[PDB]
Symmetry: C3
């Protein structure tokens, strides 16, 4: 792969060399290994979370009595675990012989935490088996452990899918990079009030933007549009997870 | 190109190996060969098809009397063939000497059909010369042939451009991968009612989302925005194809 | 990197070979070198420029008295220079030892001009130090020099960031390719009137679509969402540049 010509950057003005933490360099290498290895496609969709938000906000009492803050993330984690069980090609990996996929029978999901030294993706194990407030607490713990360099590498391992949420900073949608050997990563952005046709007039609904990137070798376009559609359906009525 | 480290996936839970059809493996290889070879950009645009939909729906009688179902696809095929004639760099390919483009003087277009064994892209030849109901029928035939493994490889050959339509499952936009040695692929998603400024108030218009990925080596950014703009214009009034 | 199988294209119809200008071939090579080398992500955002447009239009008198046309580009250039100073990782480059970043202490920005022979990206030096009408004039000069093959290669050098504006042709958003060894490129598309929730009803605001692609090795997802958010904030009130 042809390298970039070196440029003498100080010919154009003052420069200064800051160095990279080992975590950024590790990060850097893994992403470039994902990028050259995975033919990426991104599927955009946005979900109606007007009702999910109201749920979230009404349960602020309960959540505080349990010491967890309830955010959208445990609600995202729960719906994607249901779905990763319904559509198992998403919960799997290409075997190194290129000719089989390892379907994992377990659901562990990581999520991106951006710390000072770099990106960490702590994994929550068997997300399918935990409740909203369990997930809430654990997510929170692992994030502080991650910020405070106290996350032992055991916890960065063997995830089946990654969620990257930037809803807290902003943006309309992005195209995340798959953490190979996983096969898909959900990027989530800022929710906004949007007019939505109700058959007669435009209603304001709160809409969460979602960006699913996938490994096109394993997941085709119709499988991915069916996954973000189902996910949009589950987030608009989380009670469907009950049945 | 550095390979992905092998992970022992059964350390984290129960796994199961399902194998890949030869069609998926073929599929897989061709996409990775496209991905490493084509510097991709995706241009998003959305077109006003309120009038095209009404046309489509009013001609349901005619279409049934001819045995074809009229969908948006023959209407997409016709407009892109007009346009592939107007903007010939889109209907062409990079010569293997990297220093010339083969402009094709013919317009054959394929479209993605996702079958059980994998993705097939049957080609309709000389789309420029067929009418809406001819195109309607043929598309339909090739798709059933494709589902039923009866599509002879002659029909997967020598296309100039690909349309991938996921409007039937959902999604807001995606970033398709170019089927090299073609130079562009139109991805089409779900149409929705959207408010559109009429200079004075917001009108509800039915808007089709379009995602053109292209080979940035051959097509520059301004050529691609001019192609989806023209396409948006042609779909809002298909009568412009007449003149 | 596996090559594309050669196809005999004249088996399917009449072909014609047109050749590539040296500028397209140069262009072609640089993009493929960027693509294989940079793990790309694109961050979408859109900014409220209703007030910026009114400013622009009210100062048409002044601009004409100075001989410059005031467009959105000098306003984009100014806000990104402020911001490139606030978020210096965006104004920097990966050292060839892969383990340090060269932070540039200067702000020179290029912008894409698509000419007949190919894409040129003239650079305006020390954009941070020039005013709106200086920037206006210079941009304009360099563009005509670029169209007329009179741009000496000195002017295509040592830029820290690229803006590619296609707002003049159309489109909703695109995913530009980073001009390595730069680390980010802002793509800008067509502004449209959009309903925006004001807490009580939907107001029509003029919204500029922005698409920031970045080198994920150097910039993480949260840094990029913070850059397009800040940029959206600066374009909605350019007076913040004053303080």
């Amino acid at each position: 792969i042809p390298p970039i010509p070196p440029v003498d950057f100080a010919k154009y003005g003052e420069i200064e060399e800051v160095p990279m933490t080992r975590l950024m360099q590790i990060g850097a290498t893994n992403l470039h290994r994902s990028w050259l290895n995975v033919p990426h496609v991104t599927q955009f969709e946005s979900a109606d979370i007007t009702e999910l938000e109201a749920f979230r906000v009404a349960q602020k009492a309960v959540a505080k009595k349990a010491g967890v803050k309830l955010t959208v993330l445990p609600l995202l984690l729960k719906a994607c675990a249901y779905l990763l069980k319904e559509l198992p090609d998403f919960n799997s990996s290409l075997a190194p012989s290129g000719q089989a996929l390892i379907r994992k029978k377990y659901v562990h999901i990581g999520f991106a935490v951006d710390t000072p030294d770099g990106l960490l993706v702590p994994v929550i194990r068997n997300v399918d088996q935990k409740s909203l407030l369990q997930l809430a607490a654990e997510a929170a713990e692992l994030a502080e452990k991650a910020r405070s360099k106290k996350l032992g590498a055991d916890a960065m391992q063997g995830a089946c899918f990654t969620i990257s949420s930037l809803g807290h900073i902003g943006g309309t949608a992005f195209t995340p990079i798959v953490n190979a050997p996983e096969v898909a990563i959900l990027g989530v952005s800022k929710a906004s009030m949007q007019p939505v046709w109700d058959g007669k007039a435009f209603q304001p609904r709160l809409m969460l933007p979602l960006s699913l990137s996938y490994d096109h070798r394993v997941i085709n376009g119709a499988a991915a549009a069916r996954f973000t559609k189902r996910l949009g359906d589950l987030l608009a009525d989380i009670r469907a997870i009950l049945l």
